[PDB]
Design a protein around this nucleic acid. Structure first.
Lengths: 372, 372
RNA sequence: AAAAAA
């Protein structure tokens, strides 16, 4: 390879992904990428995440990571001296944005005033800056797919964007079906949680369920949960009582609001491409797996995570806030390494003197009934 | 002044305070301090905080802040060139630890290989490094007083380290007074929160509980809070019932546990100096004020904040964690700019798979009854 | 924006 791109590895991989995307999409040539990293970064497999985010073919783009001490300026300059000794590259492109402060300093001092060399720096929101040999700025924004963004964190994911009802239905399902049957739906919630119904769904056989051909198992129950009442609430939502799938029970007990939020984003949110929105998401990294209601990556490459809670009954305000804070910080941040925008959507009305009103002070955006 | 110290200003002031303290205590000479800052840091008054942390006399140490663009290498080198044009300093001492990457880079390139100049860098936990003209490391640890640490964040504070009972008493007060009288103490908690008692202590320094009319105890409307019960619990704790101060009621309702924690630190914790421990702290910054149970700055200059909750009865798990998370993140961090180690101390037993057990995943260290 | 685009 006659062109080499040098990047410094730090905790945030997206800037390096964007710089490499920017250069390749402009030049479209075979090249080598040199990642300058450290022990700490390599323990977190950051070089692998950057490579996977780009998904080049190894026949066209060669990758190599070399290792330095993040606080040792002489060691970084020495390993760069060794690497480039007797080199034959025609173009050396250096991005000093990442790494430690000392790594950036050593890289700049090594590459400054060198022939066939260009040095760049990317402040977060500002333009990409060429520092050498010409001082000038370039508009740099490469849009990432949601898959690229999550691969950049080493995160695999599954999702289910197939909705029980379409957007026209979900736009009005609250006023026409949910609002007047809250007590019937409470009975269906207890039915979903009963171990007979929960276990009778075998997951491959017993994929559908005839509610007619079924005795008074509805007996182990919550009051509203009577056989005919469950038949009624299923017909209110337009379901075939002779073939009730578990996804249909989930819809009634709260899935409708998840679909509503997902479909509202795909149909109305303008800073979001629908191909970067996902519903009923399971994320996995190593042996950690977790579920997210709705996520989307906006056109600014910022990841949004939404907790959909159709109703919050006021006495559980502290528990709902705790669960939300736990999902964002302990799980998404500490175990997955994701820095996201957090949202809580609810059809309930959030009063100012409730614990849930504190969510905004934790950085959680709340959209309550007065906005939905 | 023949000696000038150059420091770069960023969000965290303690490293600059430590470096300036380190050099002055070693040289003990008049000097000038040059702070290289930005609009963003000076909007936060960071230069003022650093100066107040050092509390030099202006007759001996001169301060000046100059302003640069945090992402502009040419502007930083230009303003340093202008500042030092025709200078006659005998010693130029540069600490490039703070600021942005670009500020550190520009400063290093300007000062490297300059006469009568020494350049230093302070990696986080690591030793202080001289980068130029000699590569060598120095043992650096300057201990800060608690007042210095808080002045470094622009925080004024008041505290009350005078305990109602001594450590010998508080070591055994749980077994001998609290454990067997919990229901009487619930009555005193309701008494402290009653508006009669709360308001009469604003007009009086002490009450005589024998002369108080029974109808004011019945106005509390707590079953345990009867005149005779409150007289008894006060005598159990050894107080003069004819002269009850509000601090005595506070002791019974949970202050005993704050004193126990505070005194346990001063008597048993060895990585902390007793002069850097404070009890019942009120912190103030601008128009924001809040109260902290116990705080201490350890001998590694790290600030610890303890929430003392004598008892959490399991039903209050979500609220207590929410309250603690709110005090740590929304208040202490976001409004006061403090990066602390958070602890929650309780005499209760925190079972696993309870909401309080999640605190460790938020970074909150819990010491429950099995440790106290 | 000591401690890893910010």
């Amino acid at each position: 390879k006659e062109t080499i791109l040098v990047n410094l590895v730090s905790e945030q991989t997206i800037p390096n992904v964007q710089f490499i995307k920017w250069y390749f999409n402009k030049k479209q040539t075979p090249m080598k990428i040199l990642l300058v990293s450290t022990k700490e970064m390599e323990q977190k497999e950051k070089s692998l995440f950057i490579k996977n985010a780009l998904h080049f073919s190894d026949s066209f783009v060669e990758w190599e990571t070399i290792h330095t001490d993040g606080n040792d300026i002489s060691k970084t300059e020495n390993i760069l001296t060794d690497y480039f000794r007797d080199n034959e590259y025609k173009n050396i492109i250096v991005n000093i944005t990442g790494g430690t402060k000392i790594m950036s300093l050593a890289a700049f001092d090594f590459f400054n005033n060198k022939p066939n060399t260009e040095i760049f720096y990317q402040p977060i929101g500002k333009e990409l800056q060429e520092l050498y040999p010409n001082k000038q700025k370039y508009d740099m924004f490469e849009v990432l797919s949601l898959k690229e963004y999550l691969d950049a964190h080493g995160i695999s994911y599954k999702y289910d964007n197939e909705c029980v009802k379409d957007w026209n239905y979900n736009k009005t399902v609250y006023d026409l079906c949910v609002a007047d049957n809250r007590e019937l739906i409470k009975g269906m919630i207890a039915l979903q949680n009963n171990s007979y119904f929960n276990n009778v769904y075998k997951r491959k056989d017993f994929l559908d369920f005839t509610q007619i051909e079924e005795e008074k198992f509805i007996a182990i129950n919550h009051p509203a949960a009577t056989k005919e009442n469950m038949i009624k609430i299923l017909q209110i939502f337009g379901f075939d009582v002779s073939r009730i799938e578990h996804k249909h029970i989930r819809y009634i007990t709260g899935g409708w609001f998840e679909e509503y939020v997902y479909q509202k984003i795909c149909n109305e949110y303008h800073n979001v491409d629908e191909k970067n929105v996902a519903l009923n998401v399971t994320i996995q990294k190593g042996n950690d797996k977790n579920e997210l209601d709705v996520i989307y990556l906006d056109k600014d490459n910022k990841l949004h995570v939404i907790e959909c809670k159709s109703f919050v009954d006021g006495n559980e305000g502290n528990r709902v806030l705790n669960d939300a804070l736990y999902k964002l910080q302990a799980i998404i941040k500490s175990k997955f390494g994701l820095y996201v925008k957090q949202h809580l959507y609810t059809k309930s009305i959030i009063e100012k003197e409730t614990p849930l009103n504190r969510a905004k002070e934790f950085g959680i955006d709340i959209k309550d009934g007065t906005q939905l």
